[PDB]
Amino acid sequence: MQGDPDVLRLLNEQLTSELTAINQYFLHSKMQDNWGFTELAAHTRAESFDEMRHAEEITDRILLLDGLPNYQRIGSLRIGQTLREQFEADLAIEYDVLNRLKPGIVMCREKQDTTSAVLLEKIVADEEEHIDYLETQLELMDKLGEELYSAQCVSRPPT
Amino acid sequence: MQGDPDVLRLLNEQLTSELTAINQYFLHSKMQDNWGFTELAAHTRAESFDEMRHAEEITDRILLLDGLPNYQRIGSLRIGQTLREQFEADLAIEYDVLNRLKPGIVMCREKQDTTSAVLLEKIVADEEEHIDYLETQLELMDKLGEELYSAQCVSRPPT
Amino acid sequence: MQGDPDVLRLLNEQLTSELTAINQYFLHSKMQDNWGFTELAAHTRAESFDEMRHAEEITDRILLLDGLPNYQRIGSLRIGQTLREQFEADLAIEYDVLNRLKPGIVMCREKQDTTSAVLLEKIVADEEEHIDYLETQLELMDKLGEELYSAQCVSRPPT
Amino acid sequence: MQGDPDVLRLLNEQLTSELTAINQYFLHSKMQDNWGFTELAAHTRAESFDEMRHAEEITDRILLLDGLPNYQRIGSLRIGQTLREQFEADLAIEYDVLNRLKPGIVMCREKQDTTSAVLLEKIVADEEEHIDYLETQLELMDKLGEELYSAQCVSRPPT
Amino acid sequence: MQGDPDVLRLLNEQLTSELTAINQYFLHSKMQDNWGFTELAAHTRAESFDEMRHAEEITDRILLLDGLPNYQRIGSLRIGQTLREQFEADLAIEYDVLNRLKPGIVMCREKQDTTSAVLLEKIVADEEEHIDYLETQLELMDKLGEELYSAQCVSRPPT
Amino acid sequence: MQGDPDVLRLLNEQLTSELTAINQYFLHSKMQDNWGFTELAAHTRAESFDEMRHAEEITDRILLLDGLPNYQRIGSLRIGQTLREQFEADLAIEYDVLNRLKPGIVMCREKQDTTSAVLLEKIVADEEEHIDYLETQLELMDKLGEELYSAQCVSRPPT
Amino acid sequence: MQGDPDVLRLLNEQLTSELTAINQYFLHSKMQDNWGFTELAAHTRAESFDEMRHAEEITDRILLLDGLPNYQRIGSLRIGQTLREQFEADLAIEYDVLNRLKPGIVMCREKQDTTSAVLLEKIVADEEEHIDYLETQLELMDKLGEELYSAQCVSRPPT
Ligand code: HEM
Ligand code: HEM
Ligand code: HEM
Ligand code: HEM
Ligand SMILES: [Fe+3]
Ligand SMILES: [Fe+3]
Ligand SMILES: [Fe+3]
Ligand SMILES: [Fe+3]
Ligand SMILES: [Fe+3]
Ligand SMILES: [Fe+3]
Ligand SMILES: [Fe+3]
Ligand SMILES: [Fe+3]
Ligand SMILES: [Fe+3]
Ligand SMILES: [Fe+3]
Ligand SMILES: [Fe+3]
Ligand SMILES: [Fe+3]
Ligand SMILES: [Fe+3]
Ligand SMILES: [Fe+3]
Ligand code: NA
């Protein structure tokens, strides 16, 4: 049984987004750890691994639909040079997901592929929470001031 | 609390298809077990028990909607005389499910019955997986050869 | 502390090779799994995860040398459409690694970066074993024959 | 305490055979493992270690009889390039053992050295079983076909 | 067994450096503890004990090479009066180590003393990580501000 | 994958030395045990088993390199008639290993085969240590006096 | 809180002696261990670690007194070439401690610094005991005879 060509292309575009985010988040976590923000880095690393899960799920869906998962293509990394830049770069990816997926889900259901729809609805919900988390860190950076904020991202003592 | 008569009719149609699948899968597994393919048989038998669970969830839904679950009607069994035929026979039932539930779900949602819809979406998801497994079994029969595939279905020694 | 720029170029090239390998091995694993070769897929999946460890190790080193780990660039995937093509495709990557690392190690040592050299020596040893595994599988295919080899790669019963 | 000179010679010849067998079987196990026949390899390896135990028992007896255990001399290895060859090679050693030890035991008892007699009687009993196993393996190859037989020697999946 | 005279000299110089580092780091840990930066103190102290382990490993190698471990000689301590100074002082030792050991290792290998080479390669790897940590600490001080940074070094409450 | 002819020859010469050592050490332990030096014999025996491990490692590396491990050829055994002679005879083998492997390693690295080099470097480190142990035993005999030294080799009471 | 200049100088002279002792004793244990006197070496080593403890205590008392602990200066090492010489060399250090600390304590108490006096009194009690031990070892050598005494220092068998 073959999936709908547009649904499949939508899934591959999402796949590319996940692969991009895996790399971007993973690199950020390494950088964060390298700067001594070890506590922050553990969180960002986990976000990276969650993206790997999404990526695998999508790959599973594509193969079931008899498509070809695209592992060759990658989007453009935005690698931040400060904590703030990193949060904002990560926000950018997440917002791009929502813009793609919101109308994509509607399309999936019009094409009577609810299983694909449901998988993307799951992703939307996960990205909304991450977007919320990030936007809250940026808020706290302003409420706290950048130094005091950063201090909450190191262990005691710093390592 | 009375359900939409069309939604109700759809649910009863799906229940008929579950009860048919239960009998078909169960019998196929007894045959497989009776032929010597005991390892395969256990798998088929479990598939039968999952159909039972689906049938019961459908029954619950119908009763909740004040409908009358149809336990009288059974569709036409396709009993396979070879492992290949049995896989093809089970495969044909699942495709009927998809063919019915795809527009079924869209309809449920238009009639503003999301709970019934979510039940059918769950079923579509499981059926797709089972279709994939069965289609994959048939491909494996071609790659391995009939005899070779069949030998992976018996225990050691054969019981 | 600043790393030798050629050493850093070498590490980044190898990084790209690891990332290419992660994707290629992961996809091959999902394809093998989707064909029914569930026993083989588990192994291949594990080979993919070692590549991820390697990539992190190289990343750590690059960061320590105050370099810029490249997560943007990816090599050409070689995707196989049979078990044989897959083994050959994965072999081609590994062989590339050796050819790059054999001179690289000598070079790292001429440049007095032994930590980087030892890292790459470790990689070489691993790749040598993976190559030996792959090449042995290809041999087995011939000794046992395609089908019979394939049968050793499915569970009982097949899943 | 001094041993009879012919008994000591008989014992030292048997030792050479053990030492020969140790090396032959161990290399075979290595080559079988290297080939992917890892299940067979473990058995062959175990056979090598039993040979080591024989060799040590013979050494003990020689030392007790105030003789000189010969660890310098070795027989000619027959290294097989196929599973069948390896079995026939191993068989050939085991037969030489019977041919030597049968008259040897009668001799030991004639010379009233029953302890050496009993040691040699145990080795004969052990070699007969090993020979029988090798013969069965050669037979199974004929009954199952070589490829099919080989497949019973790999693990699932082939490691 | 006699060691090469230059290798032995290289080894004894490294020993002096270890002995120097042991004392410097230990005093620093004591002064950090004494200042109330008790969380930092424990890490620094641990660093001192790793130095002790290095020193013992070097001594073992010298003794094995029939040389004379020099425990009389010591380098000039650089005792810091601020946390920043202490970090810079400690850094200065670690850099001298790299500067000595880099050419030293090539020399050991030229003289075909690989065991001494490997020991020195391990120390380099360890020193690079320590240097990186010190650099990160210096950086964190800049990013967090000195007071804020210091506060990440006291316990709650300050003991 | 095919190994360099000089590296393979180097590895095989070393394998010959390991096999030779295994025999010499094992027989020495048996003699020591038969003289009543049961405590010393246990250590000598364990040394033999370590040689067995090295021989397996070399064998594996040869097989990976697609060479033929030589199990046919054994070096000349020096079998000591006193503890001192045994000690000295074992020293002579070990010093031959160092003699070969020192330029051997350098050549391995010139030929860009680091995995092989690293195996031999490990072997050299172990041998340097066994030489230390043996030379110290010989020193102890001179210090304590042979009778007294021998007494430390027996159990209480002697067995 | 500021300590008396003579008390501080007293404490620092003693610290210098502890640091000197640590080195002399540790190196002696390493030599003893390398001569095969492994049992004796363990005790000598533990003595070194006890000196380390005294040095930390003195360091703490100095810091509390607001002085500068001297970790730059080490006394003259007497490194014995035989057990007897090592024993005698260690005695000489210990007797110097008593020589200093005896009037040292009295002066401490005249200056109304009992905490410091009590630390030194503890040190003296420990040293008197280590002197007893060492003098008894030297007596034992005369009684048993050096060879025999040495034999009690090795394990069975010697390692
Ligand atoms: C037709 C409507 C049926 C319904 C709604 C139903 C429901 C269930 C359910 C919920 C279970 C529990 C196990 C599981 O769900 O996996 C079960 C077990 C079982 N089913 Fe059915 N079933 C039906 C008919 C049948 C038929 C036609 C057979 C033919 C053999 C059958 C044979 C069995 C057996 C032997 C068990 C195990 C009993 C036990 O474990 O004590 N059932 N059934
Ligand atoms: C591209 C840079 C990547 C890095 C640096 C990386 C790193 C890692 C590491 C170190 C692990 C754990 C290894 C272990 O525990 O054995 C891991 C797990 C995993 N990887 Fe990746 N990986 C990368 C890309 C990918 C890609 C392209 C996929 C495609 C599916 C993927 C899928 C996964 C999954 C599903 C897990 C398991 C997650 C978990 O168990 O929590 N990764 N990754
Ligand atoms: C001559 C060529 C030989 C080879 C290639 C060889 C190989 C090996 C290897 C690789 C081991 C691994 C030990 C471990 O992993 O701890 C081993 C163990 C052992 N060796 Fe040998 N060895 C040889 C000769 C001998 C001889 C002459 C004896 C005489 C008794 C012997 C007796 C043993 C025994 C009893 C063990 C351990 C048994 C066990 O692990 O179950 N070996 N050997
Ligand atoms: C030179 C100035 C030194 C100072 C001030 C010093 C200080 C100390 C102190 C106070 C302890 C406490 C031990 C205990 O509480 O049981 C200790 C333990 C120890 N010392 Fe040192 N020591 C010095 C030199 C050395 C040297 C040259 C070595 C050579 C190996 C060494 C190796 C060790 C080790 C391995 C421990 C225990 C490790 C642990 O507790 O985790 N020390 N040292
Ligand atoms: Fe995602
Ligand atoms: Fe996310
Ligand atoms: Fe169903
Ligand atoms: Fe189903
Ligand atoms: Fe890799
Ligand atoms: Fe690999
Ligand atoms: Fe035998
Ligand atoms: Fe046998
Ligand atoms: Fe160090
Ligand atoms: Fe360090
Ligand atoms: Fe060896
Ligand atoms: Fe050795
Ligand atoms: Fe003291
Ligand atoms: Fe003392
Ligand atoms: Na089979």
Of the candidates C43, C143, C145, the beta carbon closest to that of D157 is on C43
Closest CA to F28 of F94, F92, F90: F90
SS3 D31: helix
Alpha-carbon distance F137 to G141, whole Å? 21
The distance in angstroms from the start CA to the end CA of chain D is 53
Angle of helix A38-64 relative to helix A83-110, nearest 10 degrees? Answer: 20
Nearest chain G CA: its distance from E23 CA (Å): 6
Alpha-carbon distance B149 to B137, whole Å? 9
Pocket test for ligand 4, best of E44, E52, E77 (most atoms within 8 A of CB): E52
Alpha-carbon distance B99 to B104, whole Å? 9
Cα separations in angstroms, D103 against A116, D7, D21, D51, D97: 80, 12, 21, 21, 11
**Is the C-beta atom of B60 inside 6 A of ligand 1?**
no
Alpha-carbon distance D117 to D121, whole Å? 6
Pocket test for ligand 3, best of F20, F48, F52 (most atoms within 8 A of CB): F52
- Dig out the tokens for B1 from the structure: 């609390």
Alpha-carbon distance G96 to G13, whole Å? 11
Q: What is G82-132 written as a DSSP string?
A: SHHHHHHHHHHHHHHHHHHHHHHHHHHHHTT-HHHHHHHHHHHHHHHHHHH
Closest CA to A15 of A64, A68, A89: A68
The owner of tokens 């790749």 is C127
The owner of tokens 């691994």 is A49
Could you give the maximum distance between any two Cα atoms of chain D, in Å? 57
Q: What is C45-91 written as a DSSP string?
A: HHHHHHHHHHHHHHHHHHHHTT-----S--------SSHHHHHHHHH
Alpha-carbon distance E15 to E65, whole Å? 15
Confirm if E78 and E96 have CB atoms less than 8 A apart. Answer: no
Phi, psi of B65 (to 5 degrees): -85, 15
Cα separations in angstroms, B142 against B95, B139, C151: 21, 5, 12
Residue D113's region, left for phi above 0, alpha for psi from -120 to 50, else beta, is beta
Q: B148, exposed or middle or buried, with CB in 10 Å at 0-12, 13-18, 19+? A: middle
Of the candidates G27, G63, G72, the beta carbon closest to that of E30 is on G63
Confirm if E34 and E53 have CB atoms less than 8 A apart. Answer: no
- DSSP, res B3: P
Q: How open is the CA angle G23-G29-G30, to the nearest 5 degrees?
A: 90
Alpha-carbon distance D147 to D154, whole Å? 11
SS3 F147: helix
**Beta-carbon contacts of residue B23 (< 8 Å; ≥ 6 apart):** B74, B77
Pseudo-torsion of CA D55, D61, D66, D71, nearest 10°? 0
Alpha-carbon distance G101 to A36, whole Å? 47
Q: Return the residue whose CA atom lies nearest to atom 6 of ligand 1.
A: B52
- Nearest-atom number in ligand 3 for the CA of D27 is 5
Alpha-carbon distance A137 to A116, whole Å? 32
- Dig out the tokens for E71 from the structure: 């425990």
**Is the C-beta atom of B56 inside 6 A of ligand 1?**
yes
- Dig out the tokens for B79 from the structure: 């009993």
Most F CBs within 10 Å, among E61, E112, E113, E118, to test the F interface: E112
Closest CA to D97 of D26, D29, D18: D18
* Domain edges within chain F: 1-159
Cis peptide before E157, with omega less than 30 degrees from 0? yes
- Nearest-atom number in ligand 1 for the CA of B53 is 15
- DSSP, res A72: S
| Binding site per annotation, positions of B for Fe cation | 18, 51, 54, 94, 127, 130
Instruction: Please tell me which residue of chain E has the smallest CA distance to G73.
Output: E74
Confirm if E112 and F103 have CB atoms less than 8 A apart. Answer: yes
- Dig out the tokens for C51 from the structure: 């590549």
Q: Count of residues for chain E? A: 159
Cα separations in angstroms, A57 against A11, A18, C131: 10, 11, 30
- Dig out the tokens for E69 from the structure: 């471990």
Q: What sign does the dihedral F72-F77-F79-F85 (CA atoms) show?
A: negative
What count of other Cβ atoms lies within 10 Å of the Cβ of residue A56? 15
Confirm if B127 and B94 have CB atoms less than 8 A apart. Answer: yes
One-letter identity of residue D101: L
Instruction: Please tell me which residue of chain B has the smallest CA distance to A119.
Output: B125
Confirm if D86 and D41 have CB atoms less than 8 A apart. Answer: no
Contacts of C34 in chain B (CB under 8 A): 132, 136
- Nearest-atom number in ligand 4 for the CA of E56 is 30
- Nearest-atom number in ligand 1 for the CA of B48 is 16
Alpha-carbon distance C104 to A150, whole Å? 39
Alpha-carbon distance A55 to A51, whole Å? 6
Instruction: Please tell me which residue of chain C has the smallest CA distance to D146.
Output: C144
Confirm if C123 and F118 have CB atoms less than 8 A apart. Answer: no
**Technique used by the depositors:** X-ray
Closest CA to C156 of D39, B86, B39, D158: B39
Contacts of F64 in chain C (CB under 8 A): 128-129, 132
Q: What sign does the dihedral D30-D32-D34-D36 (CA atoms) show?
A: negative
Closest CA to C28 of A59, A150, F110, E66: A59
Alpha-carbon distance B32 to B21, whole Å? 16
- D56 CB-side CA count, 13 A: 15
Of the candidates E40, E144, E148, the beta carbon closest to that of A157 is on E40
- DSSP, res B4: P
How many angstroms from the chain centroid is the CA of residue A59?
16
Q: F56, exposed or middle or buried, with CB in 10 Å at 0-12, 13-18, 19+? A: middle
Ligand 1 centre and the CA of B49: distance in Å? Answer: 6
One-letter identity of residue C141: M
B139 and C34 within 8 Å at the Cβ level: the answer is: no
- Dig out the tokens for F56 from the structure: 């397996």
SS3 C38: helix
F39 and G150 within 8 Å at the Cβ level: the answer is: no
Would you tell me which CATH number, out of the four given (1.20.1250.20, 3.40.50.720, 1.20.1260.10, 1.10.260.40), belongs to the domain C1-159?
A: 1.20.1260.10
Alpha-carbon distance F20 to F126, whole Å? 17
Most G CBs within 10 Å, among F28, F136, F146, F150, to test the G interface: F136
Q: What is the resolution of this structure in A?
A: 2.1
Closest CA to F75 of F63, F89, F59, F62: F89
Nearest ligand by distance to the CA of G52: 4
- Dig out the tokens for D92 from the structure: 């050939």
**Is the C-beta atom of D35 inside 6 A of ligand 3?**
no
Cis peptide before F157, with omega less than 30 degrees from 0? yes
Closest CA to D21 of D153, D117, D127: D127
Q: Return the residue whose CA atom lies nearest to atom 14 of ligand 4.
A: G53
Estimate the share of chain A in helix, then strand, then coil, as percent rounded to the nearest 5: 75, 0, 25
Confirm if G34 and E63 have CB atoms less than 8 A apart. Answer: yes
How many angstroms from the chain centroid is the CA of residue D22?
7
Nearest ligand by distance to the CA of C132: 10
Alpha-carbon distance B109 to B89, whole Å? 31
Confirm if G74 and E72 have CB atoms less than 8 A apart. Answer: yes
Alpha-carbon distance G6 to D133, whole Å? 89
Q: What is G135-155 written as a DSSP string?
A: HHHHHHHHHH-HHHHHHTTS-
Residue C30's region, left for phi above 0, alpha for psi from -120 to 50, else beta, is alpha
Confirm if G127 and G18 have CB atoms less than 8 A apart. Answer: no
Report the b/e string of B119-128 with b at 16+ CB within 10 A: bbbebbebbb
**Beta-carbon contacts of residue A14 (< 8 Å; ≥ 6 apart):** A58, A97, A100, A101, A104, A120, A123
Cα separations in angstroms, A16 against A96, B109, C16, D156: 12, 31, 17, 34
Of the candidates B103, B125, B132, the beta carbon closest to that of A112 is on B103
**Beta-carbon contacts of residue C118 (< 8 Å; ≥ 6 apart):** E121, E125
Nearest chain D CA: its distance from C97 CA (Å): 22
**Is the C-beta atom of D71 inside 6 A of ligand 3?**
no
Alpha-carbon distance C96 to C104, whole Å? 12
F→E interface, C-beta within 8 Å: 102-103, 105-106, 121, 124-125, 128-129, 131-132, 135
- Dig out the tokens for D124 from the structure: 């004969």
Pseudo-torsion of CA A22, A24, A29, A30, nearest 10°? 110
Q: What sign does the dihedral F102-F103-F109-F114 (CA atoms) show?
A: negative
- DSSP, res D141: H
Nearest chain F CA: its distance from G158 CA (Å): 7
Of the candidates C34, C35, C154, the beta carbon closest to that of B152 is on C154
Alpha-carbon distance B128 to B133, whole Å? 9
CA gyration radius for chain F?
17
What count of other Cβ atoms lies within 10 Å of the Cβ of residue D85? 13
Q: Return the residue whose CA atom lies nearest to atom 8 of ligand 1.
A: B52
Confirm if G140 and G149 have CB atoms less than 8 A apart. Answer: yes
- E128 CB-side CA count, 13 A: 22
Q: How open is the CA angle F102-F108-F111, to the nearest 5 degrees?
A: 145
Phi, psi of A73 (to 5 degrees): -80, 140
Angle of helix F38-64 relative to helix F114-144, nearest 10 degrees? Answer: 170
Ligand 15 centre and the CA of F54: distance in Å? Answer: 6
C→A interface, C-beta within 8 Å: 19, 23-24, 26-27, 30-31, 34, 56, 59-60, 63, 69, 71-72, 74, 76-77
Confirm if A99 and C54 have CB atoms less than 8 A apart. Answer: no
The owner of tokens 């390669």 is E121
Alpha-carbon distance C84 to D78, whole Å? 34
The owner of tokens 């089970």 is B90
Angle of helix C114-144 relative to helix C83-110, nearest 10 degrees? Answer: 160
Phi, psi of A48 (to 5 degrees): -60, -45
Q: Return the residue whose CA atom lies nearest to atom 1 of ligand 1.
A: B19
Closest CA to C117 of E125, A149, A86: E125
Report the b/e string of B63-75 with b at 16+ CB within 10 A: eebebebbeeeeb
Ligand 7 centre and the CA of B108: distance in Å? Answer: 18
The distance in angstroms from the start CA to the end CA of chain F is 53
Nearest chain F CA: its distance from G40 CA (Å): 14
- DSSP, res F66: T
How many angstroms from the chain centroid is the CA of residue B15?
11
**Beta-carbon contacts of residue F127 (< 8 Å; ≥ 6 apart):** F94, F97, F98, F101
Confirm if F51 and F21 have CB atoms less than 8 A apart. Answer: yes
Contacts of F106 in chain E (CB under 8 A): 109, 112
Confirm if B13 and B57 have CB atoms less than 8 A apart. Answer: no
Pocket test for ligand 1, best of B28, B49, B58 (most atoms within 8 A of CB): B49
- DSSP, res A36: T
- Dig out the tokens for G150 from the structure: 């040495």
Q: What is E54-83 written as a DSSP string?
A: HHHHHHHHHHHTT-----S--------SSH
Alpha-carbon distance D125 to A59, whole Å? 60
- Dig out the tokens for E113 from the structure: 């003393």
Alpha-carbon distance G61 to G8, whole Å? 9
Alpha-carbon distance A126 to A116, whole Å? 16
Closest CA to D55 of D14, D98, D99: D14
**Is the C-beta atom of D52 inside 6 A of ligand 3?**
yes
- D15 CB-side CA count, 13 A: 24
| Binding site per annotation, positions of E for Fe cation | 18, 51, 54, 94, 127, 130
**Is the C-beta atom of B49 inside 6 A of ligand 1?**
yes
Ligand 19 centre and the CA of D143: distance in Å? Answer: 15
Q: B135, exposed or middle or buried, with CB in 10 Å at 0-12, 13-18, 19+? A: middle
Contacts of A30 in chain C (CB under 8 A): 56, 59-60, 63, 69
The owner of tokens 């079988």 is D32
Instruction: Please tell me which residue of chain F has the smallest CA distance to C101.
Output: F112
- DSSP, res G74: -
Ligand 17 centre and the CA of E75: distance in Å? Answer: 23
Contacts of E116 in chain C (CB under 8 A): none
Alpha-carbon distance A96 to E24, whole Å? 53
